[PDB]
């Protein structure tokens, strides 16, 4: 029940971030608050504990993201005011996923035998930006040695798969 | 009996067959895929493409 | 637009000035006090039913241990333990004093000193969540447990090492019947153990005084409950008399053990477990009720003689609404117990004293 | 500082914020005196009582009034105690509320007296009378049958003009009389009329110059009916712990005791026990009423009347009231329209002191 | 008889709080008069229906439920109530207020939550049975 | 577990104004309409039992007082109220008009006429959760 | 609209309005309600109300409604019989025995009472 | 094992099976679920239908069980035992109406039942 909360969080950060003007550095901070709190793991257990007063972790969140943007700050200690802090990397991986579609960009994961080329990549973008809807598309090549002599995706939540749906389906289709 | 018949031959049949799909992954493998990988690779763009 | 490698070393020496401020592994702050149950942040080496003890003084069970809090039942009175007070740690699992110099005295569900008469002075412990005595560990019960009691020894016969019901109304000379067979036991050698469970202590302590006009403090143990405890003291006691009837049950001796009311025990649990927001049964009791009397009654057994064939007889009291013998809870003991003694009121207002039903 | 502020108010459930590590303890008393400051507010003197700590420095308490004009925000003090009931001569021929404030019109009690917190625990196994003695009362049918004990607690099956307020009132004369003592009459959660009724009958008698009366009636929230038997029950404490002297402690219904500690537990929301009482059934009868003790050096003995809904002896409320009955005495009208008076039943009351 | 009488109404299709504030509405409106020294008779047709109303505002608004889903302050609200019809002393104007609810039962029993609540309230009761209603006796009153 | 405050409009606005919180403290704007139940998001400074008032003219009741909205009881037609209404205190404890005005006419609970034969006119209110006569302002029922 | 405009006195048949409450009940459980007593919706006095005071007669015509009702096991003190009885303003009981024995209508003379025999 | 692998007759003996669902039930409530009729888990009759329909007689061999099966409070119309007497061929119901009397077995000649006779 804590993706509902955090896209309801994400979005009023969104429509600040459009009526702003300033989408990139709110992303960047965004990224930066993300990337911080899965390298420090204990300042949730920091920030859970009891005996520090309100006014004293407010004051370790306004030291500790400093540089960020002010409606970042805002919205880590008003969800530090509402006990709404450990939703934080939902909310970042909410409003990324909210500001790629801004962008146009999606971001899928491919699996191939052999690691493609950078064209065949851009290639592929090309064909299923105009299936997808997108503009921009990004390819993740993952090594995989399982599947044999063929690609397959999972953009979204839609698998493209043709690499070893011929044996599988050959098999199901004799038997 | 006419059913024992039936069901006996289509689970040896099976087993046959589950040694086929085994073998028929092996020898794909087998064979030298530089000219294959990027001739299926083009081909499947293609193929998405249409469908 | 700020650095993650800046935010996340700031981060790291900010937790790095605190790390030896705080202290959560031993040591807990509680987060909710209400209604005898505390729960409390931090703990983290707490162990599950392990004495936690408040700054107030009063002990906790800890019986939840959730991924955020632990959840603690409050062994005493809950008035004088608020939100922020400290909560430590004991390292031991539920365990009351229990030794020789224990006999002759009031003591609580925690083995403290009630009457009085200065410190329990013991040398051991017995956890309170102990498992019973095995199939083969048991024997056949063979020695006649007398209560001095004509028509119970003649005809409800009682053995060292049975659990045997004694049920009945209100009013009906149950605790009679304890206390007859509890003074019997002097020149036999025999413990006994009268649990008070949820009973008036003025009526408690004329029991101490009619046990001691008979000489009868010489052997028994007096574990006290009253109705103005909180219910998780009422749910401990017959477990605190069982604890102390081991100690002498494994050391090769007879003990009995009376419980006065174990349906103020079960009311107490049922209490208990609806301040839990546990969901109940019928005549709202949790389903954990059989498993509440059953391992209590269960932990009397007959030993054989590879284990000292020392033995523990109990004697459970069930009080009935209107001789309803088919109710809930007298229908859970009835199947626990091997026999059971019915008092009736029909017998008992016409002069027929012990109104024994036959 | 120890005044924090409401955060909400739902009905006669008020819940106060403090600031951290300077919450009260449960079943404190917390004051609201509120002076309007504009037209758009309501002047309010109000009395909650701490029921659980919430969490995040929040208290849910209970109200002893309406909170009718209560605003978020708006200050409430920390008493530091709970409710602090005047005790002594000040009380004898003096009628109170729940909160140890004098309803009567002659005047209020000084700051300067003595007084006592409700809750305390029951006087401990050190401290109770080894014997039972008996309470002599001056009535045959109750010395000859159904013999009181001092201490004990004593059930009234009656009402409705059978005599049970006579039955009452020369029970006061008696033991005032003889044996020195005073009494304490708790109406808890009766009828406005009958307390009136019940008031100017002790007062033409004579009777309550030797008693002191509490009345928390109907109109009351149910966080105020619950405490009113406590309310008078540590005025009677008073008499026999600083006194040492046997005191009369009444509670016309206790059954109100019974399903207002019900409606408290449906109003901060627990989970009811079967037929709708409290899971705390037995335990509030027992916190009442393991303090009417003899002790050693005085004793409260209590007379208690018992409405026993819908004629069944084995719903809960009688049935946890029961196991604390030490005698009964049993008022019937075809006595009394007979021309015996008293009207007790001489055969349906009994007494476990008659052996 | 509307030379001397004033009519509060709430009914069926009107929303719950006004049925929930018709009789507080018949209170405020008899102890005008009654602080002035008159003597007023207020009569409440159901309040059962009164009750299920604030049973209604109260789950509607979340509070946690009682019997038969009435909440813990239901009693409460019933006697606020009814309290209110009092004889004043001479010191007060001497004016009254002189209450007679009514509640409606379903098949004759009074054993429900609502009955025992307002019986065990007022000063007494008047039972009108529908077995004496059918058999000629009107009004129908159980002696 | 979500709260009812938790709307990306409520949430945009309290970010946008963190550092200096709009206090609105008289006016309140609807978070949810249902079954003549509404909570609104606002009124700090709104009382208990108090009569206040919606956008399009209906009056409601503030019983349910939470710690971040207030449970607002409709006191008539509700199927005009929508999510983002403006809720306007209007600083008076629930009361009725109260007068010799009032006899032999038709009012509902809040105190309007119902005949229609014209205004009701009364010169003042009293409010309708009004404390009993106490026991000492009493009398034995002999009339 | 033919009572508010032809100014008739129409009829309106409800057949078991017994299932007008009951599907509300089955609605609001789903809808986030607290269920009220016996498992029926909170709000079904006002859900009855709104049905049955539009059935009126006014002063240009007017809807009498003669309206079914199928009472679950004969128990009449669950809330959603008591709450179309308390509408209610006469009963016609149609009694099996009397149609066996020829009468047509089989109304059951005692059972069936009204509010206007007077 | 043995009705399987070696294809013989086997008795199952087993005392108050009734303690298995009510082992369920004690577990249930802490296991997240919600509660259901009487307080028994909402999985009162799968989970005694994956014990209780594996106790078969097969082409194999056969098992014979005979269970003793506890009755709550002396309610035959309990959630656990009303939902396993569908799943019995024959059923002997004890009663305690008889066993006052001195009738020993107790056995209802009445309620108790069987596939056999025929
Ligand atoms: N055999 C007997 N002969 C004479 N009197 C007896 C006998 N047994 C009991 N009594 C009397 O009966 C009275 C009540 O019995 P007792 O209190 O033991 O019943 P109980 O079940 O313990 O009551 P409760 O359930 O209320 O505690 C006692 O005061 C005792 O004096
Ligand atoms: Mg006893």
Same mark, same amino acid.
């Given at each position: ?15 600040i ?16 608050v ?83 080329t ?58 | ?10 689970? @040896?049949? %099976? /087993? ?9 992954? +092996?020898?794909?493998?087998?064979? @030298?895929? %530089? /000219?294959d ?6 081909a499947?763009? +293609? ?5 | ?49 392990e004495?936690?003890?408040?700054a107030n ?25 608020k939100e ?16 020789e ?11 403290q ?35 001095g ?30 206390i ?55 749910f ?6 069982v ?39 019928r ?21 054989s ?5 020392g ?26 117990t ?21 | ?23 009260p ?9 509120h002076?309007?400051?504009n ?28 909170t ?34 004098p ?24 401290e ?11 009535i ?95 005025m ?22 019974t ?33 009417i ?63």
């Amino acid at each position: 029940n804590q993706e509902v909360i955090a896209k309801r969080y994400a979005s009023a950060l969104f429509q600040i971030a459009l009526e702003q003007g300033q989408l990139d550095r709110i992303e960047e901070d965004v990224r930066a608050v993300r990337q911080a709190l899965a390298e420090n793991g204990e300042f949730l257990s920091l920030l859970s504990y009891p005996k520090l007063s309100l006014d004293q972790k407010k004051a370790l969140i306004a030291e500790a993201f400093a540089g960020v943007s002010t409606p970042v700050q805002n919205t880590l200690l008003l969800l530090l005011e509402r006990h709404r802090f450990g939703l934080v990397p939902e909310l970042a991986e909410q409003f990324l996923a909210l500001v790629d579609d801004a962008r146009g960009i999606a971001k899928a994961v491919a699996y191939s035998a052999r690691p493609l080329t950078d064209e065949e990549l851009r290639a592929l973008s090309d064909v299923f930006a105009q299936k997808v809807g997108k503009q921009t598309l990004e390819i993740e090549n993952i090594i995989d040695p399982e599947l044999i002599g063929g690609v397959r995706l999972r953009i979204g939540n839609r698998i493209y798969d043709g690499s070893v749906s011929g044996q599988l389906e050959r098999i199901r289709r004799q038997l | 009996i006419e059913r024992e018949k039936e069901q006996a031959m289509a689970a @040896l049949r %099976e /087993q046959v067959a589950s040694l086929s799909v085994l073998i028929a992954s +092996k020898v794909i493998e087998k064979e @030298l895929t %530089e /000219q294959d990988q990027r001739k299926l690779i083009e081909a499947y763009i +293609k193929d998405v493409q249409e469908v | 637009s700020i650095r993650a490698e800046e935010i996340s070393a700031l981060i790291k020496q900010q937790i790095e000035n605190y790390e030896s401020q705080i202290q959560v592994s031993d040591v807990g702050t509680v987060i909710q006090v209400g209604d005898g149950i505390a729960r409390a942040h931090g703990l983290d080496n707490v162990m599950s039913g392990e004495l936690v003890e408040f700054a107030n003084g009063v002990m906790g069970m800890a019986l939840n241990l959730e991924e955020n809090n632990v959840g603690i039942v409050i062994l005493g009175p809950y008035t004088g333990i608020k939100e922020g007070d400290e909560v430590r740690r004991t390292g031991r699992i539920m365990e009351v004093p229990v030794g020789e110099a224990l006999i002759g005295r009031v003591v609580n569900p925690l083995g403290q000193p009630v009457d009085g008469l200065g410190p329990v002075e013991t040398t051991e412990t017995r956890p309170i969540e102990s498992p019973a005595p095995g199939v083969m560990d048991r024997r056949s019960v063979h020695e006649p447990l007398q209560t001095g009691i004509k028509a119970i020894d003649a005809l409800v016969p009682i053995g060292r090492g049975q659990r045997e019901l004694i049920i009945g109304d209100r009013q009906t000379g149950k605790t009679s019947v304890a206390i007859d067979t509890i003074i019997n036991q002097k020149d036999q050698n025999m413990i006994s153990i009268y649990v008070a469970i949820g009973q008036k202590e003025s009526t408690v302590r004329t029991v101490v005084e009619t046990l001691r006009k008979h000489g009868a403090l010489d052997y028994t143990i007096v574990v006290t409950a009253s109705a103005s405890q909180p219910a998780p003291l009422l749910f401990l006691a017959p477990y605190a008399g069982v604890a102390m009837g081991e100690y002498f049950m494994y050391k090769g001796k007879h003990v009995l053990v009376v419980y006065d009311d174990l349906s103020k025990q079960a009311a107490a649990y049922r209490e208990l477990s609806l301040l839990l927001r546990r969901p109940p049964g019928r005549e709202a009791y949790p389903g954990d009720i059989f498993y509440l009397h059953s391992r209590l009654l269960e932990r009397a057994a007959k030993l054989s003689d590879a284990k000292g064939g020392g033995s523990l007889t109990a004697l459970p009291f069930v009080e009935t609404q209107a001789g309803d013998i088919s109710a809930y809870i007298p229908t859970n003991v009835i199947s626990i117990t091997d026999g059971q003694i019915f008092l009736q009121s029909d017998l008992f207002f016409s002069g027929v004293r012990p109104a024994i039903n036959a | 500082m120890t005044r924090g502020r409401v955060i909400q108010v739902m009905g006669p459930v008020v819940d106060v914020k403090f600031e951290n590590g300077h919450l009260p303890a449960i079943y404190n008393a917390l004051k609201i005196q509120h002076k309007a400051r504009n037209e758009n507010e309501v002047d309010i003197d109000l009395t909650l009582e701490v029921a659980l700590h919430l969490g995040d420095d929040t208290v849910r308490t209970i109200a002893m009034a309406s909170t009718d004009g209560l605003i978020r925000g708006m200050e409430v003090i920390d008493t530091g105690a709970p409710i602090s009931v005047p005790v002594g001569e000040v009380t004898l021929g003096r009628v109170f509320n729940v909160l140890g404030e004098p309803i009567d019109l002659e005047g209020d009690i000084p700051a300067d007296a003595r007084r006592d917190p409700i809750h305390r625990p029951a006087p401990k196994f050190e401290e109770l009378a080894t014997e039972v003695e008996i309470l002599e009362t001056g009535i045959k049918v109750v010395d000859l049958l159904a013999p009181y004990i001092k201490g004990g607690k004593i059930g009234l099956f009656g009402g409705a003009g059978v005599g049970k307020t006579v039955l009452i009132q020369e029970l006061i004369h008696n033991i005032a009389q003889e044996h020195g003592g005073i009494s304490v009459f708790a109406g808890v959660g009766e009828r406005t009329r009958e307390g009136n009724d019940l008031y100017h009958e002790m007062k033409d008698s004579g009777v309550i110059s030797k008693t002191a009366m509490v009345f928390g009636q109907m109109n009351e929230p149910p966080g105020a009916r619950m405490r009113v038997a406590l309310t008078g029950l540590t005025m009677a404490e008073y008499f026999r712990d600083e006194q040492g002297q046997d005191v009369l402690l009444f509670i016309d219904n206790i059954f109100r005791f019974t399903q207002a500690g019900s409606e408290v537990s449906a109003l901060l929301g627990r989970m009811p026990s079967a037929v709708g009482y409290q899971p705390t059934l037995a335990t509030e009868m027992g916190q009442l009423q393991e303090r009417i003790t003899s002790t050693a050096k005085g004793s409260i003995t209590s007379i208690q009347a018992i409405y026993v809904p819908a004629d069944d002896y084995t719903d809960p409320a009688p049935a946890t009231t029961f196991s604390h009955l030490d005698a009964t005495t049993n008022l019937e009208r075809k006595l009394a329209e007979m021309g015996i008076y008293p009207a007790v039943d001489p055969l349906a009351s009994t007494s476990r002191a008659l052996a």
